[PDB]
Design a protein around this ligand. Structure first.
Ligand SMILES: COc1ccc(-c2cccc(S(=O)(=O)N3CCN(c4nccnc4-c4ccc(OC)cc4)CC3)c2)cc1
Length: 848
């Protein structure tokens, strides 16, 4: 039809990639995944409650934090309910249902009304106590009033979805072989000899290696040689990768899955365009080929074809000594970055039913399996069929994440990690979502349980689905390595989210494309900002607003908010290397009880996915702290990669950098004075109440950021990259932008404000040291979780292209090993290194 061809053409523009494109493909896998995902998508669309889908309430089952409780004086919460123009402040209990709060409204003077948060497409509905709604919790934390507009449900017809579209391998004792025909590149000019190393890999584990003779590095090098491996064909596991690498030293690589998605041994002829190494990475593991056929290195190979095909079948007492049990338990209580030795692995494997009794043992036990041995692998599966302990176990997200990393390539190992994730409520899925999307890079096949968990969760909740879109779209628009997989996963989502989200995504995508042009132009007018730039900006925004540009769009980093018209007078270009656009918008919603403006920074030039990852991890730290009743007042500002080297960032209101506070100079030229931050703080606070409230928030936020940045290894920052709000909330910005050194930014200007300038102690600095220690020890209760996120982040987001060594930073900084008091002391040390010390690093940067 056309019809369907129009839709597909719609889809393509949203995704920013053509899933029907069959040009950079050498098999069926992608098309096969497209059709495979029809079922899971249709089962979730059909099974969806349409009423709750449309109103997407955002709730949690977590207790309301202690902190939080102390903001509810007499078991009471006030809710102001608007209707045209009148508004009454009902009195409510924290366990009252929105059902109960509507009866308590009509009786306190046609059932079809919901409470809608004023100024936002956010609903307080369903069978949840009002205190357990995240908006309600947001309000309680920030000391704001809870304003709701009594109105009519959203019509679920707007979310309507358009009706849609052998010889056994274990009988083969032959050793496996690949013919290397040759390599061909259109131009050399690196400025030698070369060989091809051929690896049989299973999830980063090298099973097997054969290599070619060196030959001179011409534009074309023929070999043309059989490389016979030590490994039999019957022992090739599912997920086995043929990895082909070109040396002198590593210059190019490419991969070919040896067992395909239909369980068939790969046969025949391939010409494969390779990826280049650029002067330890999820990129190294991709099954995708370079689409750039004009410029890339190519390798030509032949797989030992047999006119008969080869599948891959689908698998159908005693007691431990006391001291070996203790040997084992010591292994199991060791952290994720701790190397297993050959001995440890053998102990793990020999005593593998004992090991199964401990869910924490599983990464290390599955890391002790010989995946290059058909019979051992078979015994691993017999083991995983015996899973009562794993299934009864309390979800541990840290443990589960670990089974979904680069070390686990077996479908069946990974499927029990996803099994566990099913029990996460939507609030927790949102916390981990970007890390779960990224973990899709460690999957061998396009269609995986993980991909289907993400799809399912995205289709079941519009807030999840919103972030799944942008997170997937971000990767598609800058990862050639994975854009084909992620595009197929994104199209799948897109075919089940409903007509209204499709409409919304289009406008957002449209707004974003318009603003890209508008900032490309301004970057190039402005050399390394003049009248005739804020001429041509205010000009271009006008000639768009006003054009062309949508009447409203949803804010991608905060989908409950809708932006309307530009505030053209408030829009500047920031005085910065990359000329970011500071934009401000009118809020589309009339029921918005303020006049405040929606601020959005748009920047070309930098890859914003690193920031995303760090910001997401800090939010995890806050939920970790929340479990121990600590609020460190972070501001993990919104920030979304929207396409290639572009994206938007939340303007935090009433906020300046610390540099600007100092640069009302001060006599440059140079450095720096201790009061000023405090005077600015007094200058911005009216009452002595608010001032001291501000000094307090400062003590918490400073502590949060000192801990959070130290653990992540990104605390040695210059103060043009540290901001503070008028109410005292300190925050770091711009994690892109990742001797003498410093573990964090605690400069004399922060110390004054705490009242310990020049150099002694004070009540506030005493609180600071105490809060830092509690915070630090709380994160350490979750050492494993943090070690896995950090190591995943580096591998999926941090070029570099990183080395077991960069990853080990965090265990050092988390002082793995140590006890509560040696760790308390370590961090109290770090607080002292900053004090010594003072302004040198800030001054030093001046030095240029
Ligand atoms: C207003 O609240 C903010 C929220 C987030 C951010 C932000 C977060 C991450 C990155 C960016 S950026 O790349 O657009 N940024 C880079 C650093 N940057 C500066 N560099 C040197 C000196 N000053 C700045 C700067 C100026 C103003 C400012 O906000 C008022 C923030 C930083 C400005 C623009 C900005 C800035 C302000």
């Amino acid at each position: 039809s056309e019809e369907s061809q129009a839709f597909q053409r719609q889809l393509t523009a949203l995704i920013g990639y053509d899933v029907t494109d069959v040009s950079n493909v050498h098999d069926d896998e992608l098309e096969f995944t497209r059709r495979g995902l029809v079922t899971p998508r249709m089962a979730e669309v059909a099974s969806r409650d349409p009423k709750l889908y449309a109103m997407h309430p955002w709730v949690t089952s977590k207790p309301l934090p202690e902190y939080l409780w102390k903001k509810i004086a007499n078991n009471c919460i006030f809710i102001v309910i608007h209707r045209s123009t009148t508004s009454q402040t009902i009195k409510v209990s924290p366990d009252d249902t929105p059902g109960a709060i509507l009866q308590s409204f009509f009786t306190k003077m046609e059932q079809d009304f919901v409470l809608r948060v004023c100024g936002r497409d956010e609903y307080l509905v369903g069978e949840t106590p009002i205190k357990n709604f995240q908006w309600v919790r947001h309000c309680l934390k920030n000391g704001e009033e809870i304003h709701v507009v009594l109105d009519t449900p959203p019509d679920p017809a707007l979310d309507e979805v358009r009706k849609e579209e052998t010889v056994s391998l274990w009988d083969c004792d032959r050793k496996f072989r690949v013919k290397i025909r040759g390599i061909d590149i259109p131009v050399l000019p690196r400025n030698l000899t070369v060989f091809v190393e051929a690896n049989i890999q299973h999830g980063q584990q090298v099973l097997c290696q054969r290599r070619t003779s060196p030959k001179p590095f011409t534009e074309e090098v023929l070999w043309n040689v059989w490389l016979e491996f030590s490994i039999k064909i019957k022992d090739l596991p599912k997920g086995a990768l043929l990895n082909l690498q070109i040396y002198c030293q590593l210059l190019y690589y490419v991969n070919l899955l040896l067992i395909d998605h239909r369980f068939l041994l790969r046969r025949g002829e391939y010409v494969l365009h390779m990826w280049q190494i650029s002067g330890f990475n999820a990129d190294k593991l991709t099954s995708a080929t370079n689409p750039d056929k004009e410029n890339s290195m190519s390798i030509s190979i032949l797989l030992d074809n047999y006119c008969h095909p080869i599948a891959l079948p689908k698998h159908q007492r005693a007691e431990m000594p006391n001291q070996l049990r203790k040997q084992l338990e010591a292994i199991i209580a060791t952290d994720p970055l701790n190397p297993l030795t050959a001995e440890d692995k053998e102990l793990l494997w020999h005593f593998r039913y004992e090991s199964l009794k401990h869910p924490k043992a599983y990464p290390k036990l599955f890391s002790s399996v010989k995946w290059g041995q058909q019979e051992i692998v078979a015994k691993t599966y017999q083991l995983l069929a015996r899973r009562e302990v794993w299934d009864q176990s309390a979800l541990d997200v840290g443990l589960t994440m670990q089974l979904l990393d680069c070390n686990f390539s077996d479908e069946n190992v990974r499927a029990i990690a996803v099994q566990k994730l099913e029990s996460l409520e939507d609030d927790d899925v949102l916390h981990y979502l970007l890390q779960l999307v990224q973990a899709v890079k460690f999957e061998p096949y396009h269609d995986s349980a993980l991909a289907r968990f993400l799809l399912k969760r995205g289709l079941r909740n519009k807030r999840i689905g919103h972030f799944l879109f942008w997170f997937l779209r971000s990767e598609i628009a800058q990862s050639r390595h994975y854009q084909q997989r992620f595009a197929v996963i994104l199209e799948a989502y897109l075919r089940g989210c409903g007509t209204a989200m499709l409409h919304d995504f289009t406008q957002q995508v449209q707004v974003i494309e318009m603003l890209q042009k508008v900032t490309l132009d301004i970057k190039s007018l402005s050399a390394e900002v003049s009248s005739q730039v804020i001429s041509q900006l205010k000009q271009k925004l006008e000639n768009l607003q006003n054009s062309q540009l949508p009447e409203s769009f949803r804010v991608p980093y905060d989908p409950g908010l809708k932006a309307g018209a530009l505030a053209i007078e408030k829009c500047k270009v920031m005085a910065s290397k990359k000329k970011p656009l500071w934009l401000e918008f009118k809020c589309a919603d009339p029921t918005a009880l303020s006049n405040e403006t929606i601020g959005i920074i748009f920047k070309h030039g930098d890859d914003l996915r690193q920031d995303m990852l760090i910001l997401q991890i800090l939010r995890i730290m806050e939920s970790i702290w929340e479990t121990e009743s600590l609020d460190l007042c972070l501001l993990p500002y919104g920030c979304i990669s929207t396409g290639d080297k572009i994206g938007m960032i939340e303007i935090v209101k009433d906020a300046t950098t610390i540099a600007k506070i100092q640069q009302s100079t001060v006599g440059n030229t140079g450095a720096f004075k201790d009061e000023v931050l405090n005077h600015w703080l007094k200058e911005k606070s009216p009452t002595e109440e608010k001032f001291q409230a501000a000094v307090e928030r400062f003590v918490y936020s400073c502590a949060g950021y000192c801990v959070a940045t130290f653990v992540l290894g990104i605390g040695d920052r210059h103060n043009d990259n540290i901001m503070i709000t008028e109410t005292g909330n300190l925050f770091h910005i711009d994690f892109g932008h990742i001797k003498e050194r410093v573990p964090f930014v605690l400069t004399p200007d922060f110390l004054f404000v705490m009242g310990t300038s020049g150099k002694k102690t004070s009540p506030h600095f005493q609180k600071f040291q105490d809060i830092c220690v509690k915070a630090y020890l709380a994160l350490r209760h979750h050492t494993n979780l943090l070690i896995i996120l950090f190591s995943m982040m580096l591998m999926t987001g941090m070029p570099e292209l990183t080395s077991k060594e960069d990853i080990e930073y965090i265990r050092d900084a988390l002082t793995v090993g140590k006890n509560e008091e040696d760790a308390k002391k370590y961090f109290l040390d770090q607080i002292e290194v900053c004090r010594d010390k003072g302004w040198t690093v800030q001054f030093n940067w001046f030095l240029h």
